[PDB]
Amino acid sequence: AFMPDARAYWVTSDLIAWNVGELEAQSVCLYASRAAAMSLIQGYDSKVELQPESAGLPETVTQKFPFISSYRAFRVPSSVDVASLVKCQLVVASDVTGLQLPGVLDDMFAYTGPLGAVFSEDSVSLHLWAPTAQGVSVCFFDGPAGPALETVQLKESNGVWSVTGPREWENRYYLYEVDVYHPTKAQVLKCLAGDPYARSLSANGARTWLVDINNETLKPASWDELADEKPKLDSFSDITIYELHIRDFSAHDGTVDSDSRGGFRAFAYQASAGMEHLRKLSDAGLTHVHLLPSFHFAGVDDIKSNWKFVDECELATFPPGSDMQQAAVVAIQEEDPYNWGYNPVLWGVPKGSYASDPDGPSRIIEYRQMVQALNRIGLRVVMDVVYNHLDSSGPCGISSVLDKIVPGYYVRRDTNGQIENSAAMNNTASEHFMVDRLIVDDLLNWAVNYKVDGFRFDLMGHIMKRTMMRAKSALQSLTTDAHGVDGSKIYLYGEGWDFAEVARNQRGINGSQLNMSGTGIGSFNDRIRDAINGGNPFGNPLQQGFNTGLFLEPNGFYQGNEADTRRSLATYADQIQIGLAGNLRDYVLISHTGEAKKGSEIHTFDGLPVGYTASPIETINYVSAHDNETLFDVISVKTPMILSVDERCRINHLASSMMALSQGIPFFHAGDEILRSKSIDRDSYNSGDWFNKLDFTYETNNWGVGLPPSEKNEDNWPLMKPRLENPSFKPAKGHILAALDSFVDILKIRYSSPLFRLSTANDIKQRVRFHNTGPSLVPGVIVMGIEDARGESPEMAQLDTNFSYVVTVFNVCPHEVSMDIPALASMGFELHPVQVNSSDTLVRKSAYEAATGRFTVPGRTVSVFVEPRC
């Protein structure tokens, strides 16, 4: 009907911004209608002329909203009751358009008092920030399915709606009824919404459970003593991360009771094959498990009686390169138990589908029991937090909450008023005060109420840097005496990708890789990933890299002439070595041309620095993650088809060892260690248990279970089919167990010397040297030396009581190499004791010759040499 866009901005109590011309600016008015009854302006309750502000927009405004800094400014007269107007339908007219209100809403209504439910001895109170709402009431219910028992009116003060009732309100269910103007419908609508500050929910978040999160009955045995029982963490430099999905972990695990597979409770089965696996990794030195999204997300029904399943017996009979398996999975993929969970509804509540019973307390106590179980086998717990976007927006539908209550505020919008979608639809606006508040409050909820040990930030580049830093400070100031957790050990990292509307700091300084340099917050190092694997997950799948045969073992995909592939290989080796040295801006490497270059002076294909950090703790080194192809699958695609699976097994080990022996923080995708496959699925978020299988019997790796789902993969099916059909590509249990044994040993090696985990940039610059460099380097070999104090009157602290020097040779060549390093001649090097005793017969052949400083290393092998002190 009347359905304006919103090209103007109400930025402060007294200023409106609108990009009109000078003559147009001489007659602008503001029109309001409480009933949203305006027509094309007619049908308004009030009008006021806006006098152009020749001074323009002040610094506070242009700093907060850089993308509108050139807009003309208009002064709102003191006669205007702003609090009343922001509840109405508004337009400005010169041309007619609506107003984007977040600036003025923060300016007038930013609030730091209590939100959500507050309990006291004799009362329960509710508080909701909804400054644009015309009315707010609460509907109470006595259970998850009953009818409403009563409706209570809330009263507004300074933008916040509140009501206090008796203690007996505890454990009721409730919803807010919010009467508010929704721009997408140009109407004032009555919306039923859960509490943004919810701490529990009925199934699918249908109602909010008015639970006291501090109730004794929600605490597992010994919960309050957990801080004392937590694994020691001396330094962030000691962190290694293992990235795991909660359903993947136990969906197929026959050692877990059938009715307890797929959720939080599976982690309480201490003797299960899955928990024995995690214990094996932790004992070897793994410190942290990063769990995929585990808060209230859309895309899986919490009501288990609605779950559908493929006939996994029938699908097993289909050919390994058939498209029938994926067709069957896809036919029910919206009704199965499976999703990665990157679809946020309410951040502060555990996912009901992972609980035994989605109504009542089980989701809370079982989440706590999971954290406690992981901690008790020596693993700290990281949550994958998704603050950059929402599942849904608008007035309707069970999965929209924040945007029902304060429409157009929690979500970021373009200059026409339309919601921004670059972060997987319905991008949030952390630049707005109460969004930033909710993000920080949520982090503190998980840290305090669930004793979570760290956080991985999905699309961190879409979050304001100021939000990241305020969160970091608040988290790291938590103490055991005041809060029950040692905040000083809580670690933060994320995806610092810079793209779309947040690029060039257009919405403020965002959490990009470059902007987070010097913050102590980690970001994923895509440079080392791509240099090792080759190309980029969105480039040609056959593009080779340092560890997939570029130059050394061409795969038949044309990638240039021999001189060019040789140089491209050497260029990738430069990028890898910067990454192995913590991916630092200032680390100086002899590059492939012979020229000494800082990490920042070695560039990406887009001219950005390869090395971008100020500290090794800012670097998350990885070759694999839940996104894109698994390590095994990328290797199987890019290497020559003729390689044996035995050869590919060694190549997998090389990749994970480059991570495990790097400076910075190594990150492993669950399954790296056991050759995990998704049958080459590049984006398995909705591909079910069939394509995402984690087999802790080690009988299968899930290679050859059909072409993966067509939506994301069909364009690449022709390269996939002959590989999936070829029996020589599929590993057996022996290979899987061999991969696991060597992964365990390389972790033992990392944790055998503090020299692999240097804590500062200065230490790395002083101690880490690369020895196969320049135009005449031996292709396919990286030699990395790490020095400790030795002799009398040393110029560095002694960090290692067992070893005075470590040298690592990564040999990706399919043949033995002899690397002569005169600088390391006449020293006491011997093969690392772990490798002397390796179950791999080949690595045992590695040798050092003192007279020449010659390190002889077999094909496709990582060899670690130590100089003992005793």
Ligand X SMILES: OC[C@H]1O[C@H](O)[C@H](O)[C@@H](O)[C@@H]1O
Burial class (CB in 10 A: 0-12, 13-18, 19+), 122: exposed
Q: Does the annotation place 839 within a ligand binding site? A: no
How many CB atoms are closer than 10 A to CB 779?
Answer: 18
Q: Indicate the residue among 12 and 600 with the shorter CB distance to ligand X.
A: 600
Q: Indicate the residue among 558 and 605 with the shorter CB distance to ligand X.
A: 605
Q: How far is the CB of 439 from ligand X (least distance, A)?
A: 25
Q: How far is the CB of 210 from ligand X (least distance, A)?
A: 44
Could you say whether residue 605 binds ligand X (CB under 6 A)?
Answer: yes
Whole-angstrom Cα distance, residue 589 to residue 771?
10
Do 695 and 739 meet the contact criterion of CB atoms below 8 Å apart? no
Could you say whether residue 536 binds ligand X (CB under 6 A)?
Answer: yes
Q: Indicate the residue among 322 and 536 with the shorter CB distance to ligand X.
A: 536
Check residue 231 and report its DSSP letter.
P
Query: Which one of ligand X, Ca ion, Cl ion, none interacts with residue 322, CB within 5 to 8 A by kind?
Result: Cl ion
Q: Indicate the residue among 252 and 527 with the shorter CB distance to ligand X.
A: 527
Q: Indicate the residue among 322 and 421 with the shorter CB distance to Cl ion.
A: 322
Whole-angstrom Cα distance, residue 497 to residue 459?
6
SS3 823: helix
**The two three-digit tokens of residue 484, written as one number:** 């029950």
- Torsion angles phi and psi, residue 683, rounded to 5: -160, 80
Q: How far is the CB of 2 from ligand X (least distance, A)?
A: 40
- The neighbouring-strand residues paired with 182 are 187
Q: How far is the CB of 855 from ligand X (least distance, A)?
A: 35
Q: Indicate the residue among 223 and 318 with the shorter CB distance to Cl ion.
A: 318
Q: Report the residue closest to Cl ion, judged by CB.
A: 319
Sign of the alpha-carbon dihedral angle for 622, 624, 628, 631: positive
Q: Report the residue closest to Ca ion, judged by CB.
A: 338
Q: Does the annotation place 338 within a ligand binding site? A: yes
Q: Mask: binding to Cl ion, 677-716, rule CB under 5 A, as x and -?
A: ----------------------------------------
Whole-angstrom Cα distance, residue 809 to residue 785?
9
Whole-angstrom Cα distance, residue 570 to residue 554?
15
Whole-angstrom Cα distance, residue 406 to residue 38?
21
Whole-angstrom Cα distance, residue 316 to residue 774?
51
Q: How far is the CB of 675 from Cl ion (least distance, A)?
A: 23
Q: Report the residue closest to ligand X, judged by CB.
A: 538
How many CB atoms are closer than 10 A to CB 579?
Answer: 29
- Return all residues near 793 (Cβ < 8 A) that are at least 6 apart: none
Q: Indicate the residue among 679 and 686 with the shorter CB distance to Ca ion.
A: 686
Q: How far is the CB of 317 from Cl ion (least distance, A)?
A: 12
CA angle, residues 837, 839, 842, in degrees to nearest 5 = 90
Q: How far is the CB of 344 from ligand X (least distance, A)?
A: 22
To which H or E segment does residue 784 belong? strand 781-787
Query: Which one of Ca ion, ligand X, Cl ion, none interacts with residue 605, CB within 5 to 8 A by kind?
Result: ligand X
Q: Indicate the residue among 228 and 606 with the shorter CB distance to ligand X.
A: 606
Query: Which positions are catalytic?
Result: 458, 495
Do 400 and 357 meet the contact criterion of CB atoms below 8 Å apart? no
- The neighbouring-strand residues paired with 334 are none
Could you say whether residue 121 binds ligand X (CB under 6 A)?
Answer: no
To which H or E segment does residue 256 belong? none
Q: What amino acid is encoded at 738 in this protein?
A: A
- The neighbouring-strand residues paired with 428 are 411
Query: Which one of Ca ion, Cl ion, ligand X, none interacts with residue 536, CB within 5 to 8 A by kind?
Result: ligand X
- The neighbouring-strand residues paired with 866 are 806, 830
Query: Which one of Cl ion, Ca ion, ligand X, none interacts with residue 606, CB within 5 to 8 A by kind?
Result: ligand X
Q: Indicate the residue among 339 and 445 with the shorter CB distance to Ca ion.
A: 339
Query: Which one of Cl ion, Ca ion, ligand X, none interacts with residue 336, CB within 5 to 8 A by kind?
Result: Ca ion
Near ligand X by CB under 6 A: residue from 538, 793, 795, 870:
538
Query: Which one of ligand X, Ca ion, Cl ion, none interacts with residue 686, CB within 5 to 8 A by kind?
Result: Ca ion
Query: Which one of ligand X, Cl ion, Ca ion, none interacts with residue 333, CB within 5 to 8 A by kind?
Result: Ca ion
Query: Which one of Cl ion, Ca ion, ligand X, none interacts with residue 558, CB within 5 to 8 A by kind?
Result: none
Whole-angstrom Cα distance, residue 704 to residue 725?
7
Strands (E), 101-197: 116-120, 123-129, 135-141, 148-153, 155-157, 160-166, 173-182, 187-193
Q: What amino acid is encoded at 657 in this protein?
A: S
Q: Does the annotation place 122 within a ligand binding site? A: no
Residue ranges binding Ca ion (CB under 5 A) = 333, 336, 338-339, 686
| Candidates 70-78, 104-112, 135-143, 313-321; binding stretch for Cl ion (CB under 5 A) | 313-321
How many CB atoms are closer than 10 A to CB 110?
Answer: 16
- Torsion angles phi and psi, residue 422, rounded to 5: -60, -25
DSSP H helical ranges for 55-157? 59-64, 82-85, 102-109
Could you say whether residue 856 binds ligand X (CB under 6 A)?
Answer: no
Near Cl ion by CB under 5 A: residue from 135, 231, 319, 828:
319
- The neighbouring-strand residues paired with 49 are 29
Q: How far is the CB of 455 from ligand X (least distance, A)?
A: 22
Q: Are strands 28-33 and 46-53 parallel, antiparallel or unpaired?
A: antiparallel
Query: Which one of Cl ion, ligand X, Ca ion, none interacts with residue 802, CB within 5 to 8 A by kind?
Result: none
Q: Mask: binding to ligand X, 554-593, rule CB under 6 A, as x and -?
A: ----------------------------------------
Q: Does the annotation place 686 within a ligand binding site? A: yes
| Candidates 111-119, 223-231, 287-295, 317-325; binding stretch for Cl ion (CB under 5 A) | 317-325
Residue identified by tokens 């470059």 is: 514
Do 701 and 676 meet the contact criterion of CB atoms below 8 Å apart? yes
Could you say whether residue 606 binds ligand X (CB under 6 A)?
Answer: yes
Query: Which one of ligand X, Cl ion, Ca ion, none interacts with residue 618, CB within 5 to 8 A by kind?
Result: none
How many CB atoms are closer than 10 A to CB 767?
Answer: 20
**The two three-digit tokens of residue 674, written as one number:** 């056991």
Residue identified by tokens 């070897």 is: 284
Which has the closest alpha carbon to 658: 565, 743, 773?
743
Q: How far is the CB of 707 from Cl ion (least distance, A)?
A: 9
Whole-angstrom Cα distance, residue 276 to residue 260?
17
Query: Which one of Cl ion, Ca ion, ligand X, none interacts with residue 338, CB within 5 to 8 A by kind?
Result: Ca ion
Q: Does the annotation place 26 within a ligand binding site? A: no
Task: Tell me how many residues contact ligand X (CB under 6 A).
Answer: 4
Do 611 and 598 meet the contact criterion of CB atoms below 8 Å apart? yes
Whole-angstrom Cα distance, residue 136 to residue 169?
18
Q: How far is the CB of 561 from ligand X (least distance, A)?
A: 24
Task: Tell me how many residues contact Cl ion (CB under 5 A).
Answer: 2
Q: Does the annotation place 766 within a ligand binding site? A: no
Q: Indicate the residue among 669 and 767 with the shorter CB distance to ligand X.
A: 669
Whole-angstrom Cα distance, residue 327 to residue 322?
10
| Candidates 130-138, 321-329, 643-651, 687-695; binding stretch for Cl ion (CB under 5 A) | 321-329
Q: How far is the CB of 603 from ligand X (least distance, A)?
A: 12
Q: Indicate the residue among 539 and 774 with the shorter CB distance to ligand X.
A: 539
Q: Does the annotation place 491 within a ligand binding site? A: no
CA 657 to chain centre: 23
User: Residues forming the annotated binding site?
Assistant: 282, 286, 333, 336, 338, 378, 686
Annotated binding site for Ca(2+): 282, 286, 333, 336, 338, 378, 686
Where does this chain bind ligand X (CB under 6 A)? 536, 538, 605-606
Binding footprint of Cl ion on the chain (CB under 5 A)? 319, 322
